[PDB]
Swiss-Prot record:
Free-text tissue specificity from the UniProt record: Peripheral and central cholinergic nervous systems.
Protein name: Vesicular acetylcholine transporter
Gene: SLC18A3
Native source organism of the sequence: Homo sapiens (Human)
Cytoplasmic side: 61-66, 118-127, 178-195, 253-262, 316-328
Subcellular location: Cytoplasmic vesicle, Secretory vesicle, Synaptic vesicle membrane
UniProt similarity note: Belongs to the major facilitator superfamily. Vesicular transporter family.
Entire protein: shown range: 30 to 476 of 532
Amino acid sequence: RQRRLVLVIVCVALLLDNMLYMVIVPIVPDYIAEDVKIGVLFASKAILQLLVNPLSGPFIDRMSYDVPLLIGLGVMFASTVLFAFAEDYATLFAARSLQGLGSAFADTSGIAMIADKYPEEPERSRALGVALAFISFGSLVAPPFGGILYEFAGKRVPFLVLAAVSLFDALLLLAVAKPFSAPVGTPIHRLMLDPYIAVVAGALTTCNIPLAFLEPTIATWMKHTMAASEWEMGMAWLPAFVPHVLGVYLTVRLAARYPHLQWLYGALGLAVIGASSCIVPACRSFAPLVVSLCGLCFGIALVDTALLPTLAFLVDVRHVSVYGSVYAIADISYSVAYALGPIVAGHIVHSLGFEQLSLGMGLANLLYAPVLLLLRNVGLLT
Ligand SMILES: O[C@H]1CCCC[C@@H]1N1CCC(c2ccccc2)CC1
């Protein structure tokens, strides 16, 4: 019961955090208006994650997994409270940077706590799949409705309501966990010297590239090619939520009957992502584009659900069984992808065209797929 209650509290926090990172992208240009200046503002949450994760990683290994989560929740609450009262450039920049710092402190600690509370292989992937589903829901389904709510009630009251909800969740966590009631880990620099973790980091940073490079430069192409309407341009990623949860469930089911092929699922996911990315530019209608975007989210779910518990298993079987400096590496990879994306995607599209960036991303994803054969012999380690 205690494990189930704490998991729900952690999952709710991840749903609200990912919803806040997306609902502000369309709002910001209204209060600002030179296109380079706007790009740096958006790519500021991910930049601070690269500079803070190497420092907040080992800190989690030293003070368990409750205090960092509380600090992260407090920072995110403060960040939300300054967006409601923000109508300038510097204020929005500061709010986005605070969002990045809070994410860096609060995502790694939550994932590490989920990994630590479930030390058994059959029920670890099952617990991580729920968190992945919550993250995908918050990132995909909610911002469409937030955009509709903004045009009707403004941005002051909804952000205050979200901040109040986050504070209530933080208070619930503080009451349940009771952090104030009655080993030395492997250094992060030396952890990356393990050949079995560098390949996983490379796989994550390669798989997170299509979303980061396609989010800021897809609506313009859709408008210029299909003459899409506002509803078509807005409700594009919403029907992609069902394939993600289906893929997560399928991976969880398959990892319990054959508990040694955790590399095959990752390779298949990478190949599916590459094929979908290569197919995306060859769509001239709304439904084929929706299907091709559904395939990408289906592949991402497979890759994540296959490669997330593998890091915990490797740390258990080859290093000191402590987490927090290991998921910092995954956060660093995701952050570097999402920080490189929204500054150069538009320039690449302008200089080379939309039909070639997608081909390059698909080619990279396809080429990295056979690299995962190096994890073939894992599971025999003692
Ligand atoms: O890959 C994971 C690695 C770091 C932790 C979280 C990362 N991941 C980011 C994409 C997210 C997602 C969001 C929207 C649609 C599909 C998938 C799933 C989670």
